[PDB]
């Protein structure tokens, strides 16, 4: 009531039209709540027993009297009256508004008020009455079982009062309804006032829109705007028996097996014939073409070149070269160029090596590093050679052995030269002992390493000379001691069509990359030889590859190192790693194409030779596809040949064995001993061929991505797609078009027999597959319907974050006929610019239902990272494909745990389950039943097959899905959506293929047009596009194809089960992405095959002619039929990439791994170095660091990831000159260290990989901020003020940009705006709105920073804004040559930074920042900003760093076992929040004013009707915890990252049993740091589960102690009480199964408890080992060495003193002579032993504690006293140690040996033990302890917890739910409810003094009287029932003082005013009985004794003063109102007085 008044008063003050919407909605929510509360309070005070708060339905039933077990059994039941899916579990917890109990009748009243009562009525009834009726029926059934004395009945009432209170009377008549109506009218008037007077005019529309959904729910949706009615498909009559008969016809003849048998004689023979085909399909060569670019030669340690040393070198070089005699035109040109260079003026020489700013142009020098050579300066032959250059197929005889021998000799010599040594944070510890020592320290001295560094210098010079202004001029650089001398030529500029850079590479002959058969010549100076290489041309893509050849080779070698360590379990030997590095480098600097194809095909060749049956011949043919030209290709081919033959020969064995798969022994057929797989490069041998496949994959990934995109491959794929289209027309001409499209029929197939071909499907087969899939989909119709209806068919199309992505997407056809290649985000803008509205997905299909689908080949140079695939399509095609794929993914996700696998992180259960069934089936036998009981034994054998059937194929008629989808059982009540999908498939059937511009130019620019190409131009009639039917052009029809394949496989299963009923053949499969795993089960005779060879013969004789294919090798005739049936659906099992296995363990292991490692981490690692964003420094370092953190996600070990990060940082610090000693080093200009500088200004960086794996990408800046603020607050060091000034300068330099951010991209701190290559042109529509308009619009409609707009008006603006975003524009043109070259340019001395609106060099920015910091001064605003940032914004990221600095790693010396590769998800933190709708919606709701903003926010949000509430809640925290205000946009921007859930779908490839928790995966990474040893992360070995276990243990011991101290039956109690997952019995079971988590004071009792319940003594004896122990363990990488020279030790010790399970880590920092003793031991004797051991260890090396005398230390310390030792803050003056850190997190359990002589005491609440008979007695544990933070109010009861006590029976079961339990335990006051108490009094209990009061009433009133017929840390409840009885009263509050006159007056008045004889006392309300007893407690004691006289005196007063009941105080606690009201509610007045 008063709530309305105070809201009124607080709202009146606000002036009209001044409140924003959000507060208005808040106020009206409050007013509605208060108005509802008025009626709720009325009902509660009038009728309900409830008077304080609502109670759950289960609670009310418990109060009723029904035992708990009934409810518990009822819990599992699901309501059948509610088809939606409501569960009774959720039904219990809901709280009806009001409840009342009368006998077995329960009356629930739900109170609501609404304008339209009928709605409230019907909705509330539908919600509750159905479940209530179900419960009524179930409890009636239970009563009929003899469980309940009488039935229970539910009387559900609803009181729906009109908003105006018109129907108050009829709904609920009362004596005060008028005031209720008054209040309702006033509150409604207040609603009107606030809604019409207290809002801004601009925001009124938004407010009304909000109410339309919150309080109105009036506007009714017009269905799904209706869905058009397209024609459907009528099912045809197809019976499986027809297909079975056809198979019986087709399985009666010989059938060739598709695949071949893997035999060494066969694999070797395929090569010998493919060679004899290759050498004769091509002409013959005899001059191996050059393969090496840049032929260096190093014979000395290489010093990196510098501008100075370069001068001296180049001088010495030309000193050498000039006096040589040229003999070839190239040598002549070199001689002339050297002559010109040496003879240059000193001014020219000065300007040559000068920066671009100090450059002074000269006659002979025009640009730095270049000079001009003119015709007069040159020579005749050199001039002719220049003219020939500017004015500008055969294969090696691979068959011949001579060529192979020569090439092998050459390449092996080169590789032996690169192997020739030259003649000169936690992770660091491991990286120095494991990766460094064995990889870097072994490669650092190789000729490859130094040559690798040399080629960097030769590539940097070329890159610099490739500039537009430098190209046309010559140049002459030199290198190491004038040995290698680069002679660049006047190359072409960047331009297009190849920026061919031409150069010559004269060098000194020696070991290294020298190939003296392709050199232009070999000049001899007598003492040495100089090799003048031929002029070599290189383009950008093949120049970047060489430029980072060393880094790529080193990362490849590191990955190979990792794989070898995982495989062999030990580090490689130096020779192997050296050879591997040499091979990787040689491949890296030979980025050709043929090798990139050989290695690509080898990945699939390897599994095709390590399997019984597979098709190798096709793959081996693929090897001989392109001509073999260079010696390197022939060498690689020879090495392959040898390796493949050796691998194949291993199959001559396959001895059967047993291993144990999953959980079954299981037989095998594996080549275990004599099958070890060789290695491709070195002389090592791998245990598992998985390592070989990984090595070959690493070789393949070394080749540039650019290469796959080459014009030849574009022509190849164009012809591939045209060829299949041409054949489709051949079929459409041979047969009717309808036959090809709709599909032929069975009666035609079994009359032609040739229609069983690809691109021709069978209608009957399709229908039968659909029916077979329905057989399994018919059991989950409801789930399928829900999934289909939940795909959001009624949401705006372009608003989805997949239609406004960056993926490639064809656009509009230009005038010339060629089709554009725009991006999807552009297309959304283009359609939205001419739409006027945003159409739903279905609606857009209706509009674009006539535009023929168009598609084209993606543009390589416009290719995008997000673009996966190779074809692009226009908007109508994408819409249709989205419809189809959404429908089929909704349908196909309901069999995702049986046949297909989508998610669950990355689930294998579909395949894992299939194997388990097959494995169980195989472990058995079959008895084929002949006549009589005589059986034939048969041994069941499996035969696996792994084929990729689901993959898109170039020829695959898509019409089949038309018929298929018609029959598929979707479960929808109607066929509108099914028909929509059918029609969609009918519009993606005919497509227009548009031929590319590049191919158009190429084919036109060629003299010869072969017939192989003539047809390709006939397909296109207009020379620009043709018609392709069937093939859907690599569209995203993934799940649809998978479902179709699964349906056809099930069809084959059913077909086979009918063909051979007698046999027990088993077939089971499972799909995953593009690959499946078919498990064919087949039978073989156990005998010599005589009985079966007769049974089959007699079967064939009988007439079952389909038994000729089941005569031998059944699995062959199983796979034949399966393939044929799959081919009936146009699915053709690939004859190349298939693998049949006899159930090897290696086969299953590799297949399962292939389903978890989606992308090898090499690809990612090698991708980091190349293709940097180019967005500057902080965005190049950040991008590279981020792509090297995604490689750590895909299995890459932390050490290799750290190496990759180090290389990427070294590279990124060389483009911008940020490394020490370079130009832009911050320390040169700034006044702070190089590691204490903000990253954007050129700091160092985090540089770790764990800090970058969990924390983030820019944690260096956050740590800088935290340190600076903490120091500048606690101190005032000017250095930290300088740092803060630098950060403020960065901010000031960041806010001068334009407006762009959004949530998830908030870039706090600052960022120097590095110049970005602006594209020549601008993307269409990117400039639709002026940048000024965008800035203001963004600053105005802040909401759209968080929620994608949904209206066309506010969506075009958002899309165009997204276009104008640097990270997007740069992403679009990543492959653009201009951007690539700009990236490769050394941005060192160029003006690239932006300062004050001008382009300046990074040095200028550094100087300006330094000046700003010098002049910087602190202020309130920026200090507050920094404090808020560090404390709140970057708060979820400091947590990770603090986590990673508290974990002590320790190397338990062993070898780590390698397990499977599961893929968990790195959910930052799994939680169940109290705020729903997601922070984006909640915040966007706040900053929303326009009506459109309401429309966008409400639709996007998930529970709109609660959005407001969320905000309120979100406020309470931000002020309660942080203390900040939210009402500002800037503070919200600051705090948004702290709340916004990351929502990052991060998948990590962990190995073994690793939970999905983020801490778990981080712990696993910390356990994977060492490749060969086993780390044991110390803290807790893992720290919701832990704290829940802690609370459960606390309650368990608490109840144990209480019950044993009160003698109650704890035994049954522990079966009864329940706690959020199980009962205390199950809690103890879990404790014993896992282990009592370590705890300080509860272990001591947790063991006493367990030993007395379960009988196990594990915990009790375990605690007794903490008594004392030893076993000091060590680390393995920080062991201290012994020295007899000093008689001491030396080194960094890390011993761990294990006192049972109490660890004590001791570390000794040798350099600082310090130590950090971190322990967990907390007792005097144990800790004395700890000091004994640690002091011994410390003295041994020679050291002593940091002793010191402190009277009392402020913090926690280990002060010494005479009594002994003790942690904590002391006061007593005594000596103290230092460095003593008590971290209880180190406590970790471990199996311990030895027993104690232990005896228990006092019912087992104490325990006293001894080590043995020798040791003295010691008190081990006792229960006299006090526990804190114990959760009593979560205890629940499952059974009747009976509490017989003091010979008194109590029923505590409802008290459990009441929550008063604790009070009862602690004898604390409380107020019992009325129904709960009445149930506690279920057993009769009456007040004794009532008898004496009745006697007094009889004495004074003989007639009217009562009718009593029918009758520290120990708490013990000494109080009898009086305790709970007094819970309503207040005990002695009545007191023993009494006034007899008052008591007599009250007694007479009550007797004369009430008829106490109306009903017997036993038939009243127990609670009111207690109330009246308390009112009359101890009343007659002071009256009866002298009554005979006292009454007389009372009478006198009645006749003397006329006393009244209001003037009488009974003793001291007169309560007239309560007494009268309760008596009236329990006693009617006198009948005579009623009339008056």
Q: Give the orientation angle of helix 1278-1294 with respect to helix 1259-1274, to 10 degrees.
A: 130
SS3 (DSSP) at 728: helix
Q: How many helices (H) and strands (E) does the chain have?
A: 80, 50
DSSP β-ladder status, 1622-1623 and 1617-1619: antiparallel
- 1259: which 2 tokens? 């944690």
Using alpha carbons, list the distances in angstroms from residue 1840 to 72, 152, 1595, 1856. Answer: 12, 19, 19, 11
Report yes or no: 1850 and 1880 within 8 Å, Cβ to Cβ: yes
Give the DSSP letter of residue 167. T
| Active-site option among 59, 100, 124, 592 | 124
CA–CA dist 901, 892 (Å, integer): 10
- 971: which 2 tokens? 């479960």
Report yes or no: 326 and 535 within 8 Å, Cβ to Cβ: no
Q: Structure resolution in Å? A: 3.3
Cβ within 8 Å of residue 1669, ≥6 positions away: 1698, 1699, 1700, 1792
CA–CA dist 1147, 1323 (Å, integer): 50
Cβ within 8 Å of residue 1503, ≥6 positions away: 1476, 1477
Q: How far apart are the first and last CA of the chain?
A: 34
Cβ within 8 Å of residue 348, ≥6 positions away: 362, 363, 364, 365, 371
CA–CA dist 1837, 1378 (Å, integer): 74
Domain boundaries, the chain: 2-216, 292-424+457-547, 716-1154, 1212-1444, 1451-1561, 1579-1669+1793-1822, 1681-1786, 1843-2035
- 1276: which 2 tokens? 């005032």
* CA proximity to 1078, closest of 1065, 1092, 1094, 1088: 1065
Name the H helices within 735-837.
737-742, 746-752, 763-777, 781-789, 824-832
- 1839: which 2 tokens? 């059974």
DSSP string over 1672-1698 = -B--SSSPPEEETTTTEEES----B--
CA–CA dist 851, 1648 (Å, integer): 80
Q: Which residue has the tokens 């009244």?
A: 2004
**CA dihedral angle for residue 419, residue 423, residue 424, residue 429, rounded to 10 degrees:** 40
Q: Which residue has the tokens 């500039």?
A: 467
Q: Which residues sit opposite 1689 in a β-bridge?
A: 1682
Q: Which residues sit opposite 1965 in a β-bridge?
A: none
- 231: which 2 tokens? 């024609």
Three-state SS for 1061-1115 is CCCCCCEECCEECCEECEEEEEEEECCCCCHHHHHHHHHHHHCCHHHCCCCCCHH
Report yes or no: 862 and 808 within 8 Å, Cβ to Cβ: yes
What's the chain's length in residues? 2036
Find the helix or strand (DSSP H, E) in which 937 lies: strand 935-946
* CA proximity to 898, closest of 911, 889, 881: 911
Q: Does the annotation count 592 as an active-site position?
A: no
DSSP string over 587-622 = HHT---SHHHHHHHHHHHHGGGTSSSEE--HHHHHH
Q: What is the separation of C-alpha 1856 from the centre of its chain, rounded to a whole number of angstroms?
A: 40
At residue 106, what are phi and psi to the nearest 5 degrees?
-120, 125
* CA proximity to 896, closest of 641, 756, 1071: 1071
- 1058: which 2 tokens? 């009918």
| Region label for 736, one of left (φ > 0), alpha (ψ between -120 and 50) or beta (otherwise) | beta
Greatest Cα-to-Cα distance within the chain, rounded to the nearest angstrom: 155
CA–CA dist 336, 326 (Å, integer): 10
Q: Give the orientation angle of helix 1940-1953 with respect to helix 1889-1900, to 10 degrees.
A: 80
* CA proximity to 1017, closest of 997, 1036, 1003, 1037: 1003
DSSP β-ladder status, 1774-1776 and 1748-1750: antiparallel
CA angle 76, 82, 84 (to 5 degrees): 95
**CA dihedral angle for residue 1567, residue 1571, residue 1574, residue 1576, rounded to 10 degrees:** -20
Q: Which residue has the tokens 């230390």?
A: 1753
Three-state SS for 404-439 is HHHHHHHHHHHHHHHCCECCCCHHHHHHHHHHHHHH
Report yes or no: 1254 and 1440 within 8 Å, Cβ to Cβ: yes
Q: Radius of gyration over alpha carbons of the chain, in Å?
A: 44
CA–CA dist 76, 419 (Å, integer): 71
CA–CA dist 1334, 2016 (Å, integer): 73
CA–CA dist 1807, 1662 (Å, integer): 13
At residue 1800, what are phi and psi to the nearest 5 degrees?
-100, 165
Q: Which residues sit opposite 474 in a β-bridge?
A: 371
Q: Which residue has the tokens 């110390």?
A: 1578
CA–CA dist 1218, 891 (Å, integer): 55
- 1852: which 2 tokens? 């505590």
Name the H helices within 1954-2003.
1966-1975, 1981-1984, 1987-2000
Find the helix or strand (DSSP H, E) in which 927 lies: strand 925-929
Experimental method: cryo-EM
CA–CA dist 979, 650 (Å, integer): 55
* CA proximity to 1518, closest of 1475, 1467, 1469, 1487: 1475
What are the CB-based long-range contacts (under 8 Å, 24+) for 170-178? 172/42, 172/43, 172/46, 174/42, 174/46, 176/42
CA–CA dist 808, 867 (Å, integer): 6
Using alpha carbons, list the distances in angstroms from residue 1337 to 1051, 1300, 1357, 1360. Answer: 59, 11, 8, 12
Q: Which residues sit opposite 664 in a β-bridge?
A: 661
Report yes or no: 1316 and 1177 within 8 Å, Cβ to Cβ: no
- 819: which 2 tokens? 């089709």
> Which CATH fold topology does 2-216 show?
Restriction Endonuclease (3.40.91)
């Amino acid at each position: 009531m008063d709530k309305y008044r105070e809201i009124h008063n607080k709202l009146k003050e606000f002036s009209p039209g001044t409140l924003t919407a959000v507060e208005c909605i808040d106020y009206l929510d409050r007013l509605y709540a208060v108005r509802h509360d008025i009626v709720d309070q009325m009902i509660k005070h009038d009728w309900s027993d409830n008077k304080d708060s609502e109670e759950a339905i289960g609670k009310v039933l418990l109060f009723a009297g029904v035992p708990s077990n009934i409810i518990t059994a009822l819990e599992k039941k699901i309501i059948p009256n509610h088809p939606t899916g409501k569960s009774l579990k959720a039904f219990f917890k809901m709280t009806p508004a009001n409840y009342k109990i009368s006998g077995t009748t329960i009356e629930f009243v739900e109170v609501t008020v609404t304008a339209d009562v009928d709605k409230g009525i019907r909705e509330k009834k539908l919600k509750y009455e159905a479940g209530l009726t179900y419960i009524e029926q179930e409890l009636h059934k239970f009563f009929l079982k003899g469980e309940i004395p009488q039935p229970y009945k539910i009387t559900f009432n609803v009181v729906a009062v009109r908003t105006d209170g018109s129907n108050i009377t009829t709904q609920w008549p009362s004596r005060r309804n008028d005031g209720v109506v008054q209040y309702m009218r006033l509150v409604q008037a207040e609603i009107s006032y606030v809604r019409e007077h207290l809002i801004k005019t601009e925001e009124r529309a938004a407010l009304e829109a909000m109410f339309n959904l919150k309080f109105n729910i009036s506007t009714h949706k017009s269905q799904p705007y209706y869905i058009p009615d397209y024609k459907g498909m009528e099912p045809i009559g197809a019976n499986i028996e027809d297909l079975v008969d056809y198979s019986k016809d087709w399985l009666s003849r010989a059938r060739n097996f598709s695949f071949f048998e893997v035999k060494g004689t066969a694999v070797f023979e395929c090569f010998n014939s493919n060679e004899a085909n290759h050498c004769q399909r091509y002409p013959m060569s005899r001059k191996p073409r050059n393969f090496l670019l840049i032929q260096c030669s190093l014979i000395t340690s290489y010093k990196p070149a510098t501008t100075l040393s370069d001068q001296i070198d180049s001088r010495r070089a030309c000193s050498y070269i000039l006096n040589l005699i040229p003999d070839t035109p190239a040598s002549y040109l070199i001689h002339d160029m050297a002559y010109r260079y040496i003879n240059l003026t000193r001014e020219d020489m000065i300007n040559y090596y000068a920066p671009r700013i100090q450059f002074k142009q000269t006659q002979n020098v025009r640009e730095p590093g270049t000079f001009k050579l003119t015709s007069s300066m040159l020579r005749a032959e050199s001039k002719a050679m220049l003219d020939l250059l500017n004015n500008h197929i055969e294969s090696l005889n691979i068959a011949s052995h001579i060529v192979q021998s020569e090439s092998v000799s050459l390449i092996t010599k080169i590789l032996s030269d690169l192997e020739l040594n030259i003649t000169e944070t936690v992770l660091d510890k491991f990286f120095q002992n494991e990766t460094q020592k064995y990889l870097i320290d072994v490669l650092k001295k190789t000729t490859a390493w130094h040559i690798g560094h040399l080629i960097r210098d030769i590539t940097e010079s070329l890159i610099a000379h490739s500039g537009l202004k430098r190209s046309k001029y010559w140049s002459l650089h030199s290198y190491n001691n004038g040995n290698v001398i680069l002679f660049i030529l006047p190359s072409k500029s960047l331009e297009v069509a190849g920026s061919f850079i031409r150069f010559i590479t004269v060098f000194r002959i020696g070991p290294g990359l020298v190939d003296k058969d392709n050199l232009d010549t070999i000049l001899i100076d007598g003492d040495s030889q100089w090799g003048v290489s031929k002029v070599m041309s290189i383009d950008l893509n093949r120049l970047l590859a060489l430029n980072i050849a060393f880094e790529k080779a080193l990362i490849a070698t590191a990955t190979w190192f990792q794989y070898y360590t995982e495989d062999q379990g030990q580090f490689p030997l130096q020779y192997a790693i050296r050879s591997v590095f040499a091979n990787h480098f040689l491949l890296a600097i030979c980025q050709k194409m043929k090798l990139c194809a050989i290695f690509d095909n080898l990945r699939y060749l390897i599994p095709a030779v390590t399997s019984l049956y597979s098709g190798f011949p096709s793959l081996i043919e693929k090897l001989f596809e392109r001509p073999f030209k260079s010696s390197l290709e022939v060498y690689i081919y020879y090495n392959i040949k040898s390796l493949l033959v050796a691998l194949a020969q291993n199959n001559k064995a396959r001895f059967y064995s047993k291993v144990k798969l999953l959980g079954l022994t299981v037989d095998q057929s594996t080549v275990g001993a004599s099958g070890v797989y060789p290695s491709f490069m070195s002389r090592i041998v791998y245990k598992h061929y998985r390592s070989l496949i990984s090595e070959v994959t690493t070789c393949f990934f070394l080749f540039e991505k650019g290469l796959h995109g080459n014009m030849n491959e574009e022509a190849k794929i164009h012809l591939e797609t045209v060829e299949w289209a041409l054949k489709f027309r051949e079929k459409e001409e041979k047969y009717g078009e309808s036959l090809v499209e709709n599909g032929y029929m069975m009666w035609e197939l079994r009359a032609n027999a040739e229609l069983a071909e690809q691109q021709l499907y069978c209608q009957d087969a399709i229908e039968l597959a659909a029916i077979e899939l329905n057989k399994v989909l018919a059991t989950k119709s409801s789930v399928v319907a829900n999934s289909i209806l939940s795909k959001n068919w009624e949401e705006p199309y372009f608003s989805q974050t997949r239609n406004i992505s960056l993926k490639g997407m064809s656009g509009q056809v230009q005038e010339d006929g060629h089709l554009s290649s725009s991006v999807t985000i552009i297309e959304a803008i283009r359609y939205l610019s001419n739409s006027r509205h945003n159409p739903s997905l279905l609606k857009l299909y209706e509009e674009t239902r006539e535009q023929k689908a168009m598609a084209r080949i993606v543009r390589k140079y416009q290719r995008t990272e997000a673009d996966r695939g190779f074809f692009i399509t226009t908007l109508p095609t994408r819409c249709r494909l989205e419809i189809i794929e959404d429908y089929y993914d909704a349908i196909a996700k309901n069999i995702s745990e049986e046949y297909i696998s989508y998610g669950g992180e990355k689930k294998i259960l579909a395949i894992q389950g299939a194997l388990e069934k097959a494995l169980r089936w195989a472990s058995g036998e079959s008895f084929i039943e002949l006549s009589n009981h005589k059986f034939i034994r048969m041994k069941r054998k499996l035969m696996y097959v792994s084929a990729d059937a689901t993959k898109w194929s170039p020829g695959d008629n898509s019409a089949k899905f038309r018929r298929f989808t018609s029959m598929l059982h979707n479960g929808l009540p109607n066929n509108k959506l099914k028909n929509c999908v059918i029609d969609a498939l009918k519009q993606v059937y005919k497509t227009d293929f548009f031929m590319s511009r590049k191919l158009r130019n190429y084919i036109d620019s060629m003299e010869s047009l072969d017939p192989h190409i003539k047809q390709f131009l006939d397909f296109f009639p207009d020379g620009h596009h043709g018609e392709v039917k069937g093939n859907w052009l690599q569209g995203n029809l993934n799940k649809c194809s998978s479902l179709f394949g699964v349906a056809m496989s099930l069809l084959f299963k059913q077909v086979w089960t009918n063909l051979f009923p007698e046999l027990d053949c088993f077939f089971e499969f499972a799909h995953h992405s593009d690959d499946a795993l078919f498990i064919y089960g087949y039978l073989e005779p156990v005998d010599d095959g005589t009985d079966w060879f007769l049974f089959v013969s007699q079967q064939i004789q009988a007439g079952h002619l389909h038994w000729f294919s089941v005569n031998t090798e059944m699995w062959k005739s199983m796979f034949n039929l399966h393939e044929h049936i799959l081919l009936l659906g146009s699915i053709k099992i690939s004859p190349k990439k298939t693998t049949v296995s006899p159930t090897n363990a290696e086969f299953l292991s590799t297949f399962f791994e292939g389903c978890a490692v989606s992308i090898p981490f090499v690809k990612i690692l090698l991708g980091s170095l190349s293709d940097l964003p180019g967005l500057g420094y902080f965005d190049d370092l950040a991008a590279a660091q981020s792509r090297c953190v995604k490689a750590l996600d895909l299995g890459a070990s932390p050490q290799v990831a750290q190496l990759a990060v180090a290389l990427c940082t070294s590279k990124v610090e060389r483009l911008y000159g940020t490394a020490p000693g370079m130009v832009n080093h911050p320390a040169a200009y700034l006044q702070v260290k190089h590691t204490d500088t903000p990253i954007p200004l050129g700091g160092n960086g985090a540089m770790s990989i764990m800090e970058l794996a969990t924390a983030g990408i820019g944690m260096s800046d956050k740590n800088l901020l935290k340190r600076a603020l903490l120091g500048y607050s606690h101190k005032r060091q000017k250095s930290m003020l300088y740092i803060l000034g630098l950060f403020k300068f960065l901010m000031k330099l960041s806010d001068e940009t334009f407006q762009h951010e959004r949530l998830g991209q908030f870039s706090f701190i600052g960022k120097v705006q590095w110049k970005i290559f602006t594209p020549k042109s601008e993307f269409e529509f990117a400039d639709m709105y002026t940048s000024k308009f965008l800035e203001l619009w963004s600053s105005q409609h802040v909401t759209y920073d968080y929620i994608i707009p949904k209206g066309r008006d506010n969506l075009l603006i958002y899309l165009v804004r997204k276009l104008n975003d640097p990270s997007i524009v740069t992403a679009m043109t990543m492959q653009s040559p201009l951007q690539l070259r700009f990236r490769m340019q050394a941005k060192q001395h160029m003006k690239v930074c932006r300062l004050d609106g001008e382009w300046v060099t990074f040095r200028e920015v550094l100087a300006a920042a330094n000046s700003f910091a010098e002049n910087y001064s602190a202020t309130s605003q920026d200090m507050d900003l920094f404090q808020t940032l560090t404390s709140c914004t970057f708060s979820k990221e400091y947590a990770w760093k603090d986590f990673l600095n508290g974990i002590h790693c320790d190397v338990i010396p062993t070898k780590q076992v390698q397990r499977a590769k599961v893929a968990r998800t790195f959910t930052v933190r799994e939680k169940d929040q109290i705020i729903q709708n997601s922070i984006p919606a909640v915040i966007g709701y706040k900053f929303a004013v326009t009506v459109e903003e309401m429309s966008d926010v409400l639709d996007t949000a998930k529970f709109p009707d609660s959005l407001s509430v969320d905000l309120k809640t979100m406020k309470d925290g931000v002020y309660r915890e942080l203390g900040l205000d939210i009402s500002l946009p800037d503070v919200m921007k600051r705090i948004a990252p702290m709340l916004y859930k990351s929502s990052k779908s991060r998948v990590v490839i962990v190995q073994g049993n690793v939970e999905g928790t983020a801490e778990a995966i981080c712990r696993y990474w910390l356990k994977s740091m060492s490749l060969v040893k086993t780390i044991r992360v110390k803290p807790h070995k893992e720290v919701i589960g832990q704290q829940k276990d802690l609370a459960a243990l606390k309650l368990c011991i608490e109840v144990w102690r209480w019950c044993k101290a009160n003698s109650a039956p704890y035994r049954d109690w522990f079966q009864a009480l329940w706690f959020e997952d199980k009962t205390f019995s199950e809690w103890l079971d879990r404790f014993c199964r896992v282990g009592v988590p370590p705890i300080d004071p509860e272990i001591q009792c947790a063991a006493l408890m367990i030993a007395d319940i379960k009988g196990d003594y594990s915990v009790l004896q375990l605690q007794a080992n903490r008594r004392a122990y030893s076993g000091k363990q060590y680390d393995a990488y920080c062991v201290q060495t012994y020295n007899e020279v000093t008689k001491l030790y030396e080194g960094d010790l890390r011993v761990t003193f294990n006192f049972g399970l109490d660890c004590a880590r001791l570390e000794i920092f040798w350099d600082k002579k310090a130590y950090i003793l971190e322990t967990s031991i907390t007792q005097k004797h144990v800790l004395k032993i700890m000091m004994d051991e640690v002091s011994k260890e410390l003295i041994k090396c020679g050291m002593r504690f940091n002793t010191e005398q402190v009277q009392g230390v402020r913090h926690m310390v280990l002060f010494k006293t005479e009594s002994g030792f003790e942690w904590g803050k002391p006061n007593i003056p005594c000596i103290v140690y230092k460095n003593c850190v008590l971290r209880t997190s180190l406590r970790t359990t471990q199996a311990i040996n030895h027993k104690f002589m232990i005896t228990i005491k006092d019912d087992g609440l104490r325990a006293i033990a001894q080590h043995d008979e020798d040791s003295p007695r010691f008190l081990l544990a006792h229960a006299f302890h006090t526990i804190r933070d114990i959760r009593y109010q979560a205890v629940d009861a499952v059974s009747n917890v009976w509490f017989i006590h003091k010979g008194v029976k109590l029923y505590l079961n409802p008290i459990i739910s009441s929550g008063l339990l604790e009070n009862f335990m602690k004898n604390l006051p409380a107020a019992i409810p009325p129904a709960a108490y009445s149930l506690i009094m279920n057993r009769a209990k009456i007040s004794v003094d009532l008898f004496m009061f009745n006697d007094l009433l009889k004495l004074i009133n003989p007639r009217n009287t009562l009718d009593l017929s029918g009758l520290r840390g120990i708490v013990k409840i000494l109080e009898p029932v009086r305790l709970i009885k007094s819970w309503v009263s207040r005990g002695l509050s009545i007191e023993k003082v009494y006034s007899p006159v008052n008591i007599i007056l009250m007694s007479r008045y009550i007797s004369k005013t009430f008829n106490l004889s109306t009903k017997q006392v036993s038939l009243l309300d127990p609670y009111d009985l207690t109330e009246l007893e308390s009112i009359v407690r101890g009343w007659g004691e002071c009256v009866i004794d002298q009554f005979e006289s006292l009454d007389r005196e009372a009478q006198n007063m009645v006749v003397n003063k006329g006393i009244c009941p209001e003037d009488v105080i009974p003793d001291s606690l007169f309560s007239f109102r309560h007494t009268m009201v309760l008596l009236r509610r329990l006693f009617p007045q006198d009948s005579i007085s009623s009339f008056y």
